[model samples]
Target: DWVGKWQLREYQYPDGKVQKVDSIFYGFQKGSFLAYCMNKSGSYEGFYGYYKLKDDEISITLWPDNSSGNEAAHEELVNSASYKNFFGWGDTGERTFKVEELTDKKMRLNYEGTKYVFRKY
Candidate 1:
C-alpha cells in the first residue's frame, strides 16, 4: 500500500528556532517519495529524489535549486542496527526518527537531527 498523502506540519530548527506557522507544499508516495519546497519569495524551488526500498534501507538524494549554481548532492541509506530491524535508517549522523504521529488526514515524521527536529507533511 502507498504511504498515503500528508501535509507539511512543522519544523524545529537546531538553534531552537521553531517554525510551526510556516506552510510548505510537500508530498510522498509509498512506492517512491518526492519532496519539494519553494523559496520564501517563490523565486526558486528545491527537491529530493527517492530511491526504491531495498532489503531494509532506502537511499535519498537531494536535488539542487535553480538559484544555487552548484548542485550539492548527498546520499543517505538508513539501516537499523538490529538485523531484524535493519530496514531503518540513520540520517546525516544527526538524528534518528520514528513515526510519532500518522493518520489519513495527516502524518507526522519526527526527525531528531543533530541539532534540529524536522517534521514534514
Candidate 2:
C-alpha cells in the first residue's frame, strides 16, 4: 500500500507540459502523513496531518507545520499574507487533497486544480 516515503517527481500541467524540480519528500507513518521540502539555504517547510485510503482514493487533511504554537500553528502560518499568497490559501481552514492512482511506487493527487505525482523513496 501507500505506507512508506515518497519523493515528488515531475508533474504534468493541465496543458500537458511537465515541470521538474528538486524532490520533496512525503512520508506516511501509521495513519499520519507528512510532506517536507528543503531549500538551498537549508530551511525547510513541512505539512502534516491524518490520511485515509480507500480503494484507489486517498484523502488527506493537512496543516502547515512551519510555526510552533500548538494547534494554532496552522492558522498562523497560513494567515501571513506571503504564505497565503504563495500557497493560494483560501479562508482559514484545513487544507485537503483528493488523491488517485496510488500504488506502492506511485501516486497522483489534486489540490485545487493542480495535480502532483510522487514516487516511492
Candidate 3:
C-alpha cells in the first residue's frame, strides 16, 4: 500500500550514479502527501500537498515549506499557506511520475529517467 511513510534509501540518475542522503521522507495519505528532508545543517525543509495514485501513475500538487518539526508535525501541519504556494507555482504544481516498482515495503518511482527508491518507514 502507498498510504504510509517511506524513507529514501538512495536515488539513481540516468547516468547510473547513485547517491545517498542523510534523511529524506515521503509520507502519503489517502488524498494528501508530504515530502521532507533534514540537511547537513539540521534544518528541515520540504513540500506538501494533495496527491493522486492511480493504476501506475502518481500526480502531486506541491508547495514548499520550512516545516521544521518532528514526524507528527510533518504530516499534520495543514493550513492554506502550508498547502499551496502562489508565487513559485502555477499549473506547474501538478507533477506526475511513473511507478517502476511498488509494494508494501518498497517503492520505486521514475521521474523521467531518474529513479527514486524508497523503503517503508
The lDDT leader among the candidates is: 3
TM-score per candidate: 0.43, 0.68, 0.69
- TM-score result, candidate 2: 0.68
lDDT of 2 by residue, 77-111 (tens): 66766445334535443456677568878888776
Q: What tens digits encode model 1's per-residue C-alpha lDDT throughout 35-79?
A: 444457766333444445444333443232222343232222222
lDDT, candidate 1, at 33: 52
Question: Candidate 2 at 30: error in angstroms?
Answer: 1.5
Per-residue error at 112 for model 1, in Å? 2.2
lDDT tens per residue, model 3, 1-121: 7898889888798989998844688889888888876667868767778877788998876543234444344334343353343212333455688999989898998877878888998
Model 2 regions lying over 4 Å from their true place: 40-43, 63-72, 80-89, 92-98, 111-113
TM-score, predicted candidate 1 vs. hidden true structure: 0.43
Alpha-carbon lDDT, every model: 0.39, 0.68, 0.70
Screening candidate 2 with a backbone cut-off below 3 angstroms (N, C-alpha, C), the clashing residue pairs are none
Clashes of each: 9, 0, 0
